[PDB]
Design a protein around this ligand. Sequence first.
Ligand SMILES: CC1=C(CCOP(=O)(O)OP(=O)(O)O)S[C@@H](O)N1Cc1cnc(C)nc1N
Ligand SMILES: CC1=C(CCOP(=O)(O)OP(=O)(O)O)S[C@@H](O)N1Cc1cnc(C)nc1N
Ligand SMILES: [Ca+2]
Ligand SMILES: [Ca+2]
Lengths: 676, 676
Amino acid sequence: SSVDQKAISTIRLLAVDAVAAANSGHPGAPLGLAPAAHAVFKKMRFNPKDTKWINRDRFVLSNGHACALLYSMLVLYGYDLTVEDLKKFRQLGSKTPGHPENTDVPGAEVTTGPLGQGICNGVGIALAQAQFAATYNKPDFPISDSYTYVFLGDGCLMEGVSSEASSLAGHLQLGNLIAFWDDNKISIDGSTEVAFTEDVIARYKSYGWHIVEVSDADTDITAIAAAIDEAKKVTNKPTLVRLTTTIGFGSLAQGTHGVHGAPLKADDIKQLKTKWGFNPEESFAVPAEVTASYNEHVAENQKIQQQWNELFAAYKQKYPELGAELQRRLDGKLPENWDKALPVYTPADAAVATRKLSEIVLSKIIPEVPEIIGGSADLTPSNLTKAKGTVDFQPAATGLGDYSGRYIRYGVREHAMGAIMNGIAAFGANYKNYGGTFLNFVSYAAGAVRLSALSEFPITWVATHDSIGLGEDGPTHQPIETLAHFRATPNISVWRPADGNETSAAYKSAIESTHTPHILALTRQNLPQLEGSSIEKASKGGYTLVQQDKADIIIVATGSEVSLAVDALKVLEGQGIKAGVVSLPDQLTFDKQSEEYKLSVLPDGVPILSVEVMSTFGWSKYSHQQFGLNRFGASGKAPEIFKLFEFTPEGVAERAAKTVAFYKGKDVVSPLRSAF
Amino acid sequence: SSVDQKAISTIRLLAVDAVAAANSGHPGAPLGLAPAAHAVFKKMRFNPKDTKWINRDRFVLSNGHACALLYSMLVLYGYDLTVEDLKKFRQLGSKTPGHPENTDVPGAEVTTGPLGQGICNGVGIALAQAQFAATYNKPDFPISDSYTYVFLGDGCLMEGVSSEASSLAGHLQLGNLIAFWDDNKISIDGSTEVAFTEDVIARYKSYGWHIVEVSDADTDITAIAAAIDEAKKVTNKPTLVRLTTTIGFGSLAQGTHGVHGAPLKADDIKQLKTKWGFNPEESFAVPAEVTASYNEHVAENQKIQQQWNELFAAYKQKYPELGAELQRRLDGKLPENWDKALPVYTPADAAVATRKLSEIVLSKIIPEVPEIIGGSADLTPSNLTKAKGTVDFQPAATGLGDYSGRYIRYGVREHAMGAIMNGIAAFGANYKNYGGTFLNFVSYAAGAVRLSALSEFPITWVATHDSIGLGEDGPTHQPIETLAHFRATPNISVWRPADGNETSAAYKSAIESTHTPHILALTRQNLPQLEGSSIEKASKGGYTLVQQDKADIIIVATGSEVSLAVDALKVLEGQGIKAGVVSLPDQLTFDKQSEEYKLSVLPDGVPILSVEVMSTFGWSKYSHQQFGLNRFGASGKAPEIFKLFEFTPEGVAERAAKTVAFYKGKDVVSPLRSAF
Ligand SMILES: CC1=C(CCOP(=O)(O)OP(=O)(O)O)S[C@@H](O)N1Cc1cnc(C)nc1N
Ligand SMILES: CC1=C(CCOP(=O)(O)OP(=O)(O)O)S[C@@H](O)N1Cc1cnc(C)nc1N
Ligand SMILES: [Ca+2]
Ligand SMILES: [Ca+2]
């Protein structure tokens, strides 16, 4: 249609004008993908006035540098984003940052820009939708039937994380996922011939995806719409639509790397405008006939949501218990008193590894909290992440599970697991999802973990085998730097529970979270139940385990080293030194407590020694002296490794005594004090 | 042959017995892969008495958990590893750690165990061999003609890093790479049907690999040998050999996940021995006829190396300059006085971004040091990593470069780039290789970076756009935690040079390195040349830039914040406060200096404030108070972001004045002091 052509030109020119105003950003992919964006958004069901409608189709821009395109679509459709915001693209404090951020941009489902992430997030949105539909849909009640549309480029296809997620999505037969490859044969280094000559289509067929090819995606919106219709008929395979485009279509510099990532020249923008019937003297034009056309689609979508709300009301009458559960989840509330299922321990109970305590927690809470789902990256019998009696999330056609299942076999795919977890969280409906691996291999997923923090998603890593305590697998498996890395990242709760009560507190935090990802660092080896622990105290992140009013020293420790500190206190008593013990299961939670609470744990006037069998980085926030492990580990039986490195009651006591001596005659204030 | 069958049984039983003695480790893949290991090592050229022969074939065990297999081969072939070492498998301090470590195990080319790494390392060994051969071979002088053999399993094939490297290896037409997939249909979570149902062979064809399938790799060594011969005929494609095996072949528990990763039962070991003609009462048997057979292959290989040494002598006569260059490289020596090519600056010179200073360094040193090669992960015009006038490393058949080229187009593949760099270093011949990306995306490669440190490889990351100084791309691109992460990892030199002289010092360190990987954190934005910098002083890692004998405070800073500190010193002077400035371009190098040198930089008796626009973790090693950035960044013009966060001369001065006030009346000792 004439109006469709005008809409595509409007999108292209809004994106170009936004880049021009900022004198920064990426015009090439927006120019190339405007036809496809127009066609996809016309097929999508969404409400710009209710961005959280649970049955909306989701869109993800994995090639996030192309965000001037996304912002233009959101503005044209009347989301809470305006032309005035587009004029502030890439400007400090604006609603139009240089890559899309879900916390800041209405209609941005996830935070993209780091390549490869968005397609994996789309896999997770689609996984969640399938699980959600299997859980709630009934005959005559299609509560959930939405699609997940993803745009990606060559860069996303080169990043290994996307291969992981695409292999898994094909295995999982995720037929409501429809991805679109911007096949423009250009990246920053020039032609894809220099580095990216694989047969992408053949690779996607090998994963079990359906393929549709659109040879002229610069103009053929009829074929793009038809490709979507075709994809919707293939209910047991995710679909990749090859969009053969010209990067920067219409620019004098189209088809070149120079159009990827810098503003166009002013004369180039003028010729674009006149070629397309726009005024070359005008910027940020929005023809009223485009607004009218887009408004008609919004109004239709709002009537669809209106009818869905009536369907949901009827569902609550026909299926009273499921309807109440669904309502509670859409309200963002956990079941009343769910935390009464958390296991509680006493000091008379047996020693247990915190990985096994975690298994026990999951066993108790999964039956009580339906919005918990999770999995492991091929470490299920090691991480202990599956509750007995649950069914795996698999397509029923495989015989290996069902979409109503609760447990995901991620395979050896940590990075994609992390990004898929972000997508499950992004779906909404109160999903509280988790992923297991060895702590040292959470590092394989750092790209996604950082985005969990920036995106404010309440995902959880069940990160077992946390230290040299794992023993014989040796230094390639033993974390040193890992907790420092994640603790140094803003907005990550890094729990390292010492015992049963602390493990329950860690899960209480992880499941109640709405804005903060969690990493639970858990042991291979057994640890005793501590005298003085409780869920109540551990929920403060740091607490006084052993109070000593006339302390010569306080030992602050985490995880497996708390019991070590308690044993060292006894050695010290025989040397005439009185120690207190602080357990610090989560530094972030502790930091968020009141100043007075924190000072009650780490007071002035007493030296404080930290003990944790990994990097000492960060620990000066809480201690004057630090006993840690700042070298790689060793392959041997774990107790022998602890002895080698002097992580023994006597080794801790020796360092505590040296700390007391070092501060003799000195005035000591809390590590919590600072000059500014 | 009868002896070949006996050798295969010997290998299997040595591996099983090693696992049994440790009561730890992985018997399954060794049992399944013994026939293939026997066949491959019989085809390989190697000298157990000269592990560094530059024309040896290389073997890499990417499925490193299977290392009892590797250790058995090395023992049988008379490497510096014995049956007594096998009896100490997985025991503290042994030469047979639970995953292979190149620093500890003769004949282990790389450190494997973290899945996916070894195949990528093999790509790098093969890349280096092709570059090396193109550089040195002449008519009648095949100085380098060796192959790279890699074993991998399902786990390596699931990890995205291997997809990245396999796509690139296919593009690069690396015909001397021969990989073998242990197609046993089992991983830790059980059948591969639960998570890994892709058509692997079709995927590898899509990358441009050649395929050979061996349907009965439990017995058919004739077919495995024939597959190697076939692979050698295909000179323009890497080859994947599908070895269809039974995990744990021969065990009562063969073909099950239980055989993957735990010792066999004692009765199972007895029946293995009698089925294969061994004494069930005996462990660690080495039949003398197996030793004889293997010794004959060693003796033949040693005669091949003897002839290669004569070829090399003749090459030095026929090609005097190339021969001397090759000899120098094989001696591990850089060119005499190579560092005279490093650029030197004065304070009268213009401000320059450290990414551009890096380009200039590379431009000067690449022509002087032939063993430097490197590339970028699709960021060549941003990282500024290519010297003008050099040719890319590409197969000549593409027309895009040649194997004699110096510059690698890695594509958007940071993790594989990191692991490929490790393989290039592992090849030897003094290669000093580098890889560019944005600092924030070095994190995508953490799995490989950690292994650079553990493996002691002198690789270099050219990690540009280091901070909020990059501006508009925003918080998804702006490092916060990244330097803390890598500084907390043992054995990583993390240079953050402030100016031209410091950038030259950083490269001097990176290129001279033999055992320590480097990360060079470089700016987008221009920085002034500093009064007081030099290569000499910056080579100490930390140095006094501005000495103030009556200092009220010392400001320690890195990178872009050194100039900020110098400007703050001027503000402070107007407030009656005298400051000194320390520049700390590499914390690891500084830490390695003498205690007296370090105390001359960070003396007792004066408060010290650190300034660096990223995490404060680690900084308490060097300072009493820390001014850093412990939250995510922002999308805007960089100077506006610095102002927002008060990284301005006045903001630094305010915090310095507060630091002076906080220590009034207190006794202050160097942050370098400690109790133990
Ligand atoms: C290489 C790179 C880009 C080119 C994309 O090439 P692609 O074909 O995807 O984009 P097109 O040129 O528009 O067609 S964008 C810039 O982000 N980036 C840096 C970049 C690198 N690594 C990661 C993980 N995320 C990034 N963001
Ligand atoms: C999952 C896993 C393994 C199964 C391999 O399954 P694969 O098919 O490769 O082995 P096979 O069972 O012998 O046939 S090993 C153990 O390392 N590991 C943990 C592991 C996880 N992630 C990373 C990066 N490295 C690892 N090392
Ligand atoms: Ca592209
Ligand atoms: Ca396997």
